Amino acid sequence: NLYFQSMTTYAIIGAGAIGSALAERFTAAQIPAIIANSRGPASLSSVTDRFGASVKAVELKDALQADVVILAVPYDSIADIVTQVSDWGGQIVVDASNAIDFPAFKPRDLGGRLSTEIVSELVPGAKVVKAFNTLPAAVLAADPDKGTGSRVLFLSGNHSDANRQVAELISSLGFAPVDLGTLAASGPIQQFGRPLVALNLLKD
């Protein structure tokens, strides 16, 4: 409580390699963060053991109260998580998910709608930024500084102030943020199945 009040609070709602990748990056950048998911704080012991100096495992209800909430869970897991909070006013939600079908791994048919627009409707009041969905966990987990350039993270969203705040986080983590603009603008380029996903670039 008194620890967090002098900084923007970040929560990783994370599981698997991506949750761990984010924890690793926060730790390397010495940015305090909390982490949670549906399986509870105990299930995140692997993360705690490696990154507990900068990333603290908490209950989901607590993590969902942070200034910036990063949804690094499967796309299908989002609805059941975010429905637990009724008013998202004053918060930023970062959609890091990709809507992918199993077992063929093709982009989901969402009837033309953008996945992050659908997520946005599940968090009314929140300012949503689309980011951290573009890189494989193994790339995200790595040191973003490669001598002659910083690893690029594209972001987008309808609220310029929220985009800025997430760009600030991205820069602080050592990555190079590139703000593509609105969710409409990023739809055909940053969504799963589109040219900027899984593309490793550096800003020199």
3-state secondary structure of 152: strand
- Structure-derived torsion over alpha carbons of residues 43, 18, 62, 77, reported in degrees to the nearest 10: -90
Experimental approach taken: X-ray
**In contact, 23 and 12? CB cutoff 8 Å:** yes
- This PDB structure is determined at a resolution in Å of 1.8
Q: Which domains does the chain show, CATH number per domain?
A: 1-204 (3.40.50.720)
Strands of the chain (E only): list them. Answer: 10-14, 33-36, 55-57, 68-72, 92-95, 127-131, 150-157, 176-179, 202-203
